[PDB]
């Protein structure tokens, strides 16, 4: 209403005039499904310039460092109405900042229905449930016999809204959540995603066993790229299509430009002799007419395969890739290091987005293409 006869009641139901002259209000105020005590004494006239506002010690806790704000609000505010509008708006603010005190579940729906749906799955599956029961984690197997996990995060109403589903594998996971759908629904969807990659995981596990994988180290299930090493100081980075894994991947070569040339040239000759009946490795060995070494890691445990400018591996994602076109140096470097070296020196001469210069260690012509 316009008047605070009716607008006071309509906005603050729980404010009851004790004294005849409507001068002491008392009782409660509502606030985010939370009612609180209040005892708000006015002077002999209706003036908020002078007013006593006493509280619950619970209310003093929630009006922490707004004691002055509300003291301002009392002296500058016209009516008691407007004061209460502000004191509500203000509580809502205080509590939404302190938003780490809230959230009781509905026990008749939740705890049981969750025990029911996990019974629907089976008890062998569950690996983790948080003491808030908010997170759980579940297990599935591939036809290969590989463990694939799924993390769920649950809301106050699990069956109503979608649970947040987190899972490693690289193609984006889609869960058709209805309020009728359950843990078993999303579990079947999870098995469907596992099998679409079933050939893909086998091709990747095959590469990871038989070849010197370099540049994912303990790869997740999310990795589609696999930097394999071959001989020493040349590498091949391999991105595979997860739906056609046995099929020909986009592959290319890092290292010394005199070593990469015949390999690229023989890949171009023999790329038609790729066949998706064999594995990725059993096609690459006959395409490039090579073998792969089995973890030159343990014998070459310190060959200093570090930048030899900055002496670190892993500068900001980058790898030692740029090398010397020389048998006697073979020293790897980084894009950033070799560029900040060859630009700094006099001798260095740049064509467009290339710098020709001298290798730091051996002073032979080395080329950098940004």
């Amino acid at each position: 209403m316009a008047v605070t006869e009716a607008s006071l009641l309509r906005q603050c139901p729980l404010l009851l005039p004790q004294n005849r002259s409507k001068t002491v209000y008392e009782g409660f105020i509502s606030a985010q499904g939370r009612d609180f005590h209040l005892r708000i004494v006015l002077p002999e006239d209706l003036q908020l310039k002078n007013a006593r506002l006493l509280c619950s010690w619970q209310l003093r806790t929630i009006l922490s460092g707004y004691h002055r704000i509300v003291q301002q609000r009392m002296q500058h505010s016209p009516d008691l109405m407007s004061f209460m509008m502000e004191l509500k708006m203000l509580l809502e603010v205080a509590l939404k900042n302190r938003q780490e005190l809230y959230a009781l579940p509905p026990p008749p729906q939740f705890y049981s229905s969750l025990i029911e749906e996990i019974g629907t799955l089976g008890w062998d599956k569950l690996v983790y449930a948080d003491t808030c029961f908010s997170t759980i984690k579940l297990k599935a197997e591939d036809a290969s016999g590989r463990e694939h996990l799924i993390t769920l995060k649950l809301k106050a109403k699990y069956p109503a809204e979608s649970p947040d589903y987190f899972v490693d594998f690289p193609v984006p996971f889609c869960a058709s959540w209805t309020p009728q759908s359950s843990l078993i629904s999303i579990y079947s969807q999870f098995l469907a995603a596992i099998e679409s990659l079933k050939a893909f995981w086998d091709v990747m596990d095959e590469i990871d066993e038989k070849t010197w994988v370099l540049e994912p180290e303990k790869p997740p299930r999310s990795a589609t790229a696999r930097r394999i090493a071959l001989g020493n100081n040349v590498s091949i980075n391999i991105e595979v299509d997860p739906r056609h894994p046995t099929m020909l991947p986009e592959c290319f070569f890092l290292g010394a430009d005199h070593v990469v040339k015949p390999l690229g040239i023989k890949l171009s000759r023999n790329i038609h002799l790729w066949d998706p009946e064999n594995s990725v490795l059993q096609n690459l060995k006959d395409v490039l007419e090579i073998d792969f070494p089995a973890r030159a890691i343990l014998e070459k445990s310190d060959f200093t395969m570090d930048c030899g400018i900055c002496y670190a591996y892993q500068l900001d994602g980058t790898i030692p890739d740029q090398v010397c076109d020389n048998s006697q140096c073979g020293q790897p470097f980084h894009q950033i290091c070799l560029y900040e070296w060859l630009r700094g020196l006099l001798t260095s001469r740049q064509s467009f987005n290339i710098i020709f210069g001298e290798c730091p260690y051996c002073s032979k012509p080395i080329t950098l293409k940004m």
Binding site: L16, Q18, N19, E26, G27, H37
Partner: protein, 51 residues
């Protein structure tokens, strides 16, 4: 809260002595009959009581 906030209503309107001893009720045929005895307090020579 309610107990006090109500109690205040009574203080609006007022601001001890049992005037009426006791209440009983019988029934003749179709005919509810509530009744009450007084205390020496409520004089009907001076006051006009209804029920």
């Amino acid at each position: 809260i309610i107990s006090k906030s109500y109690k205040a209503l009574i203080n609006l309107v007022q601001g001890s002595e049992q005037l009426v001893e006791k209440i009983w009720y019988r029934v003749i045929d179709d005919s509810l009959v509530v009744g009450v005895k007084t205390t020496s307090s409520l004089k009907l020579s001076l006051n006009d009581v209804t029920l």
